[PDB]
UniProtKB/Swiss-Prot annotation, chains A, B:
This is 3C-like proteinase nsp5. Residues 1-306 form the Peptidase C30 domain. Cleaves the C-terminus of replicase polyprotein at 11 sites. Recognizes substrates containing the core sequence [ILMVF]-Q-|-[SGACN]. Also able to bind an ADP-ribose-1''-phosphate (ADRP). May cleave host ATP6V1G1 thereby modifying host vacuoles intracellular pH. Residues 1-306 are cytoplasmic. It is found in: Host cytoplasm; Host Golgi apparatus.
Length: 306, 306
């Protein structure tokens, strides 16, 4: 029993973190096989960030413009190329700790583990959702760029995020491991801001199912709803519209608890209209939206506490 | 910016987890140098748990009653002894991944990282406080016994918890790495229950300081309080009494923000009396008590957002 914001064990990723220095700029990189990935803004001075032409800044560098430090060991760079907003440095040594891995572009509402790093040294691990506005509510200080996000399935690390920037509201933006930004953001100084965000409806429903698996039913009711009647309420409370795709994903949790998805939707509509009346769900006074249906099945018992 | 329940990077601990089997019972152990530590209830049958005499159950075992599996590798047990509520198995192989480590007995209110494990395989990592009632609000399923809690300081792992049991309210109890229980609990079936708990006052104050470091002052006020006038309110709201020791620990956060500790106490007294008026602090609608002053200084910027 219990229900926590749980991260994946970080060791497979810790063995990949290095420090990348270009001039007076240092940040983190990811060392897999004989390639180091890092934000391309490593090649900028403070002033360059105001209006960088990265093609023009990079052609001015050699392989020996870059220093890679893996623990105490210096790696020699033997190649470099830009891929979207990342640099790919070829190094003289294959990482002996390279795990089985993939690169994946996650979708909004999906969750991942972040390993916060500074100077190539991991400092902390925590679980993030990709917000519908393509930001994450991370915890990052200066030096954290190149920190990575990931998921683990059966000893394969799916890398999905590399940290590039903090926006003015204190939330965080970055790229996939092909260097494509999540959301409309760019790795230069502009007036860019987080767009309006929404509550991740599917995740709120998953977490209500989690609370029923763990033995709590107080918030259920004898009502049902149509998808459209639900969505009229959802729009009032700045929730994402529920789709039939979302109903189908909740099938297994529905089956484990014997609560029809639209009957759980009716329960959520009543929670949004009435509030929680000073009550808690899995210890929370608010509706949690940073657990996916997959997270709930990973963490909760396969046997409902009936 | 941002503020998250952050765990320590788990890799140094992942390289220590093994599976321990005695008969039909399997759970997790911790492999450091040539010793494996695990809960002594590994030697019990289901029926033995009702009223075990561990001295009498253990004298009936040999070294070869125990199987230790480290990944695919079988370790041979060459020695065994009981230490309080743990077994110490001597094995034929020193763990090559043993980190620099200590064993520490943490105090109530202090925080640690838990690596949830099943069958010697790490599944998740999350941060826990030791509650004043000597339980933790963990997330554990059957098979999780022998999972460990820890802190990391400069590459030294301080191991402080080994998981033994879930109590009837769904919270979790266990021992230090000398096998002494936190709290009054025992590793047998009884009517034992979590005692009454309290809010960790010191941690609530640390987290208010975190919110000011990160640039939020909405909840401050022009009042001060005496320690005793604060404690009269604290007792009404099931908060731990604040002591001068607690005031002294908050000195550095006080200095970084320029808010006197008792002026922060006045702010908390007003939050407890008035509530939060639909507002949030570091994204929370409740007063958080699972971050110590040390956690706040580890995670927050050294420069207050004035
Ligand atoms: O957001 C960042 C860096 N960053 N990331 N997470 C952070 C958390 C707290 C504080 C700063 C943090 N930016 C703006 C930016 C805008 C588009 S892409 C990056 C940032 C990148 C490089 C520099 C810099 C400084 C000196 C030399 N070279 C680069 C200067 C600024
Ligand atoms: O709490 C536990 C085990 N445990 N721990 N975390 C859990 C989370 C969810 C479910 C069960 C969990 N107990 C009770 C207990 C009371 C004092 S010490 C342990 C427990 C230990 C060994 C057994 C057992 C079963 C079969 C064979 N041998 C032992 C049977 C029960």
């Amino acid at each position: 029993s219990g229900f926590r914001k749980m991260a994946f064990p970080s060791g497979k990723v810790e063995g990949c973190m290095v420090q990348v220095t270009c001039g007076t700029t240092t940040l983190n990189g990811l060392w897999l096989d004989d390639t180091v990935y890092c934000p391309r803004h490593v090649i900028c001075t403070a002033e360059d960030m105001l209006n960088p032409n990265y093609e023009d800044l990079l052609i001015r560098k050699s392989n020996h413009s870059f220093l890679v430090q893996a623990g105490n060991v210096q790696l020699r760079v033997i190649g470099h190329s830009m891929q979207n907003c990342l640099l790919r440095l070829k190094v003289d040594t294959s990482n002996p700790k390279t795990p089985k891995y993939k690169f994946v572009r996650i979708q909004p509402g999906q969750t991942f583990s972040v390993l916060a790093c500074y100077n190539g040294s991991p400092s902390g691990v925590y679980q993030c959702a990709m917000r519908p506005n393509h930001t994450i509510k991370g915890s990052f200080l200066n030096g954290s760029c190149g920190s990575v996000g990931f998921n683990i399935d059966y000893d394969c690390v799916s890398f999905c995020y590399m940290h590039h920037m903090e926006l003015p509201t204190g939330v965080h933006a970055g790229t996939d491991l092909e260097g494509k930004f999540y959301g409309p953001f760019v790795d230069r100084q502009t007036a860019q801001a987080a767009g309006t965000d929404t509550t991740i409806t599917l995740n709120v429903l998953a977490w209500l199912y989690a609370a029923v698996i763990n033995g709590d039913r107080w918030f259920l009711n004898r009502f049902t709803t149509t998808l459209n009647d639900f969505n009229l309420v959802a729009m009032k409370y700045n929730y994402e519209p529920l789709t039939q795709d979302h109903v189908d994903i909740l099938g297994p949790l529905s089956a484990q608890t014997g609560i029809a998805v639209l009957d759980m939707c009716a329960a959520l509509k009543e929670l949004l209209q009435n509030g929680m009346n000073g009550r808690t769900i899995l210890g929370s006074t608010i509706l949690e939206d940073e657990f996916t249906p997959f997270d709930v099945v990973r963490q909760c018992s396969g046997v409902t506490f009936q």
